[PDB]
């Protein structure tokens, strides 16, 4: 989607495996602001919005 009117996918009640997204070299950047990028698998949240 466009930046003005983007897509918001609600993800919940599933296993949020972040080890693939983190390790993947296809990304130009992967940066976190409140939670270390290597602890994402251990922190269990109520909701993630993509």
């Amino acid at each position: 989607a466009s930046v003005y009117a983007w897509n918001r996918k609600r993800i919940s009640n599933c296993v949020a495996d972040y080890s693939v997204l983190y390790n993947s070299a296809s990304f130009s950047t992967f940066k976190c602001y409140g939670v270390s990028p290597t602890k994402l698998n251990d922190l269990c949240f109520t909701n993630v919005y993509a």
Binding site: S12, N13, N47
Partner: peptide, 22 residues
Amino acid sequence: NCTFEYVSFKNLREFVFKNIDG
């Protein structure tokens, strides 16, 4: 807000519905 979704006289059907800690 659809924050959750899940999909799975001759008779008596008993049920208990309780809500604890969410």
